[PDB]
Symmetry: D2
Subunit: 328 residues, 4 copies
């Protein structure tokens, strides 16, 4: 997975992600109105939304759980795989705000209006490995949270504590921990976006054979660390050189570079890991944009067109049918 936050030329804030998995999670785009009571049937735990929510998720055992989404106030959150270095408590910890893994994303979006509000609430928080149903293990996760102020944070629970990092990179991938990736960026201080046309090697003249010689050394594989480096620098380059050109499609161009392609990222179970979908939320406007591996046309769902004072969950069908514009 790759998370990305990007400000447009008009001052709007985009936040979204690549979803990198080898399976379907029966996903749909889920809208939840204000004052809606979500009840988990297995453990009787309840959540009533303060703010309306829109995002990608699934309804499991009659309970909504999210992969990424936003609320009506322009707060966004995405859950990304975090298989190594993660540690959840087995049960509730006395004196803490205990949040089940499956419910963390919804807990953020339903309750808070800003990154600053979330940061305060997380000071005494603990993420607990309570199954959504039966005894099913929760997915190993860490979260990126971003809002209309342009501020982003990263939430990672380890065996030590619940870490909340300020994210000045604007990106997130997977393991290792966020501080590891930030330190890893320092190894690439020698990268250059500007073409290096020549090098005088003593008696031999060296000439650039094509565009892009400044970035030689950039890692090209699909590991979380390599993807983190690529997205961090691609984002930086666009902001530095083309701030006044940043719009919706640019978000997708950045994430396309770190997208997994069928056949080349094979799991030990011999399945192809794919970028199943790419989502981009315009936080101010409350519009959820996305495309899929099967259908690259961007689809838009505007939460503000729905009744925020409604009484039911509304779902929209995940679009995996290629949409072609037939010109003639």
């Amino acid at each position: 997975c790759t998370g990305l936050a990007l400000e447009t030329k008009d001052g709007l804030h985009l936040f979204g992600r690549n979803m990198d998995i080898e399976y379907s999670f029966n996903q749909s785009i889920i809208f939840i109105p204000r004052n809606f009571k979500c009840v988990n049937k297995s453990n009787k735990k309840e959540l009533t939304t303060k703010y309306a929510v829109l995002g990608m998720g699934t309804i499991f055992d009659d309970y909504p759980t999210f992969a990424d989404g936003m609320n009506e106030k322009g707060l966004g959150c995405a859950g990304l795989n975090f298989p190594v270095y993660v540690s959840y408590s087995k049960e509730d910890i006395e004196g803490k705000t205990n949040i089940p893994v499956y419910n963390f994303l919804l807990w953020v979006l339903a309750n808070f209006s800003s990154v600053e509000e979330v940061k305060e609430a997380l000071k005494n928080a603990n993420i607990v490995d309570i199954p959504i149903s039966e005894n099913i293990p929760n997915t190993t996760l860490h979260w990126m949270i971003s809002d209309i102020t342009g501020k982003s944070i990263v939430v990672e629970q380890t065996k030590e504590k619940l870490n909340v990092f300020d994210n000045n990179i604007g990106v997130l991938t997977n393991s290792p921990t966020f501080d590891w990736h930030v330190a890893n960026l320092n190894q690439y201080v020698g990268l250059r976006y500007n073409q290096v046309p020549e090098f005088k090697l003593g008696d031999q003249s060296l000439t650039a054979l094509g565009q892009g010689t400044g970035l030689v050394g950039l890692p090209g594989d699909f590991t979380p660390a390599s993807r983190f480096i690529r997205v961090a620098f691609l984002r930086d380059a666009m902001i530095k050189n083309d701030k006044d050109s940043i719009d919706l499609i640019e978000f997708f161009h950045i994430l396309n570079n770190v997208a997994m392609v069928r056949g080349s990222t094979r799991t030990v179970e011999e399945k192809s890991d794919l970028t199943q979908y790419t989502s981009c939320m315009c936080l101010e406007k409350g519009i959820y944009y996305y495309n899929t591996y099967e259908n690259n046309q961007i689809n838009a769902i505007d939460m503000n067109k729905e009744n925020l004072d409604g009484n039911e969950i509304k779902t929209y069908k995940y679009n995996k049918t290629l949409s072609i514009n037939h010109v003639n």
Copy 2:
């Protein structure tokens, strides 16, 4: 630029390219019917089409010139940048079939029905640096040619001779020469598509932190050599592991990985080099599919819907307006 040939699950043959440039060439999708006489006004040279042609190009000084295209017989050709190691003759060479640089692509498509036919015609061919108009230098180019048999060739004129390579890789980028890239592939024999989950480093257990550990070492920059390596192995992996899944969208997924992103590939003139468009021709069906940097929705133009016995050139407008599916 990156050229790609790919066979689908149904046995159809896709051929196309990323167009990587920092400028617009006033491009449109151009259809030329059978028996159409193309006259160059500056040098009075003429070409009358035997076969109908469809592809991306421009009409310069009243004369059509192509970036990539196909004919009605399922022969495809793409012209890609070749700034180093290229050498054209200044004038016609006696006893040779002399083809002006700007006219090579059209010469291939208008006259021949197969790769085998082209190969025979190229034995005594020479590419000459005749300006399309005025004294304007021709773009430095090499060509990939592919047909419905699945065979591909690469055409490169150097100071030595006009080279015609059998292309068993299914890909092409830019400089250096094709044989250089083929030899460069040998450096990556150690790549693996299958996950490497662990490594026992004596007393230290090493564990994969995410998917993709087998491809560590793959180059991630945007130079022609690095892009060649990436597209070659991404293509190979898909054919090996997912032959029965290959369809139209897979072509775009492969090329997306080597697409240039605004801001990060800066020329010495301080302009952003971009993948302006991505084309994919279904050679059997005569359908030209493409999307653009601005609009990622795939557009389709079917040459077989047009009158192949028509009397005029027909053009279709280059689509750079983002097409979004508004769901609600």
Copy 3:
């Protein structure tokens, strides 16, 4: 700098380092006998040796300070540059065992007989930035400690605490922190020491063009992170495949691979960073072996030949005069 611990075919334990600096520190090989009182004239602080010590260092303002060394009991310690992430206290911390930066190495060797003894003593230790003389800033350092049991530890003081890591890698370089490097090793689980002779790329046969195709992707620069990776895997490979062949010269072969070469590692002050010397201590035998950038012949100083019950510091001259064996 690069630290290395290696067990020989006979069961002896070698420990030593590359010294990577752009300057001379007026170094000599220093022997200190038992019961010798070292007095710092500037701050009146005193240290009386329990065990005899031998290693590379300098006598500054009449006080001995070490770069690397061992004691008579087979305990070894090396101080390596640690410019980022280091944090010393400005003054003594109440209730802690406060050790000045310049004196840490000698404090370890003079007082303790084993890694286990040191580990216990470090639990309540604190490293303080007390100048050796005047107001001169101490070098930013972290330490590797190793003994005749084959156990190694890494000592790093950060803004959080004094960290003592178990070192199961057998190596150390410079910044970032030790846990960062250990996690970085996981990115290279795909490395192979065994030749990969071929790769079938569909219709194209790829053949290894020379030996070493399994390690493609290994970083080749001279940064601390890249050097850590190289030494870790070179060491692992030798132990796995040639345990029964490991002797003195093998230690030097490993470190030669990460040695800096004049001209190519230039500081911002435009000086060449060099591997000034390479030391290798046979811990059981008490022999300090070393060579230098100028003279590659290995020199040996045996501490057990000296009087351990002596009354004076004894120094031996740093050998930087090339020693050639003239055969004819």
Copy 4:
């Protein structure tokens, strides 16, 4: 193997090589005086030396054959492995100067005084796969030739022709062909010897964590292509920044960086490929310097101390016994 030519601060010319093999070839340092008739017993072919010769080789079936050496006139030649792209004729070609593979090095040194003389003689030359004895296949080889003018050439016979390249890089390794490696250098125009201390990544400050950030992207494995890149740039950096410091030991520092280490370069036959020896010839002085994997002390054999008008081949024993300077 890695060949290197380097000019010293005093204007002397050093030429030599790493010998990278997994076996012993019963090597000794061989001196052949002037006017000495070498007779091959198996094929009755004869060679009488014009100039006296000194270098590493072996006496096989009573016939001397060389790995690397020089003559009394300051001409040097080294034979390096060339397993791919090599092509020898099966028999003598009519009208050509036919030279058996095993005899090429000696043919160069025994007959010619300069690179220019050799270049002229090679115009009509052909290298033939005649066995030294029995039906034993000759080693696949290419050659580097260098003299006291500082000029170097590379000799490679392919299926096309006998190629003689001007070598302006000052280095050679193994396969692919020399022109391939020269073109490969162009991919690294973005390398920098000078430290890059920082990078402003928008809201995140990136800081160099150690020396060497300018060379990130340099390949670190032991393949011929990677070694070629490393030696080319290490040599260039030393000449650019430290021309007035270049002496004998610097030659060894450069080659040490590309030396193979026991255990990590394993052949398909499960043997460790090693840098068995490193030779450095001072061409003006006629001194052959070398060390070995087992003994790193440099040994010197001066051909000018021998009788150049002698009547016998003289050999000196290959030194593989570690020479240590015991100080106390």
